[PDB]
Design a binder for this molecule. Structure first.
Ligand SMILES: OC[C@@]1(O)CC[C@@H]([C@@H]2CC[C@](O)(CO)CO2)OC1
Lengths: 106, 107, 107, 106
C-alpha cells in the first residue's frame, strides 16, 4: 500500500507537488495517471520520470528512496483531477496503489 | 473519441479476448492500456504498446499493427470482467487521444 | 451488474433514443438515472422512476414497465452523447443494484 | 455554482460532515451522490433529506439557508469515495454542482 495525501489545492499558476510513499518504491517503478469521471485514465508519467506523448512539459516525475513525486508546474484549471500513483510490492508480484490525490485549483 | 474501440467484447472463461483500438496516428505513436473495475482505482496494464508494469500478469499482452493496437487477454478469468481503455496521441504527438472504452463481459 | 442494460445505443441527431434497464426487482423499487460525460461530474437526470431534478430538460424522461425501466431522450442533440447509468435496489429493498452502463453514440 | 471542501478525512467509526454552500440553495433542492471509479454514481440523498432504498441509515442530509450537508455517521471503509452535491441555479433553469469532496477513512 502507498501513502498519498487525500487532496492538494493551489491557486492558478502555482506548482503542485503530489507525493506517494511506500517501502517498495526504492526498488519498484511508479506510474502516475490522471483520473476524471467519464474518460479513460490519462498516463502522465511512467517508470518514475518518463512522459508520454501529448502530456504537457509542466508535468514531471521524480523519485527518492521511499517516495515518488508528481510535480505540476503552472497549474491550470484542466489539471483539476485525481492523481494516482501505481507501483508494485517489493517482490514485483502484484500491483499496489495510493489512495489518490484530488487536485483543486483555487 | 479519436480512437475507434468497440463498446463490448464477450467471451467465456478460459478463452482469449482481443480488444482493439483504431486510429490514423497509432502507427508512430505509443498506446497505453487500462483496466477499470467497479469501485477500484484504474490499473495501467500496458504501456508503450507492449510493456507490462510489474505486477501485471503475462496473460495480458499488447500489440500494434498498422492503424490498430490490440490488448490480448489469454485465458480470460471471471475477475477480468472490466472496462478496458486505450490511450495514445495524435499524428503530431501534441495531444492525447483515447477510445470510448470496451466492456469485457466474461461468460 | 444485477440490472441488465445494453452497452451501446446509437441514433442520429433529432431522433429519440431509448435506453432500458431490466431487473426482477424493478417493479416495486424506484430507479434513478445518471448522465456521464467525459471529464465532468455525473448528472442525476431522473429520480423515483420519472421525476426530473430542477435544471434537467424536459426532453429527458423516465418510465417504468414491468421488469424494465427506460430513459427516453427526445430530440437527441450531439451534446447528449454520454454514458447513461441506471440504479435501483434489490427485491427486498436492502441494497443497491445497477446496470453496466449504456454508451449513447450520436451520429 | 457550489462550494464544497476538496477533502474530508476521519478515523473509522467517526462521523463525517460534508457541506455545500451556494446562493441559490435556500430555494433549490440538493441531491448527493457517491462517485467511485468504474461504477454508476450512487444517489445517497435526494431533495435535501430523502434517502433512496438500499442506502444505509447512517447517511443523512440536511439543509439550512445557503448550505446543505451530507452527514455520514459511523464512517466505514466502503464509504471512501467522492461525494458531489447537485442543485440548480436560482431560477431553476440549469444544473449546478460542487467540486466534489473526497472522503478518506484513516
Ligand atoms: O459516473 C460514472 C463513473 O463513476 C464511471 C467511472 C468514473 C470514472 C469514469 C471512467 C474512469 O475514469 C475510467 O478509468 C473510471 O472512473 O467516473 C464516472
Amino acid at each position: 500500500e502507498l501513502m498519498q495525501p487525500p487532496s492538494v489545492s493551489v491557486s492558478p499558476g502555482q506548482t503542485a507537488r503530489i507525493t506517494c510513499s511506500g517501502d517498495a518504491l526504492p526498488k519498484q517503478y511508479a506510474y502516475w495517471y490522471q483520473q476524471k469521471p467519464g474518460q479513460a485514465p490519462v498516463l502522465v508519467i511512467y517508470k518514475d520520470s518518463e512522459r508520454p506523448s501529448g502530456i504537457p512539459e509542466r508535468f514531471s516525475g521524480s523519485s527518492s528512496g521511499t517516495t515518488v513525486t508528481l510535480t505540476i508546474s503552472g497549474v491550470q484549471a484542466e489539471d483539476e483531477a485525481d492523481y494516482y500513483c501505481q507501483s508494485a510490492d517489493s517482490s514485483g508480484t502484484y500491483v499496489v496503489f495510493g489512495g489518490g490525490t484530488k487536485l483543486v485549483v483555487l
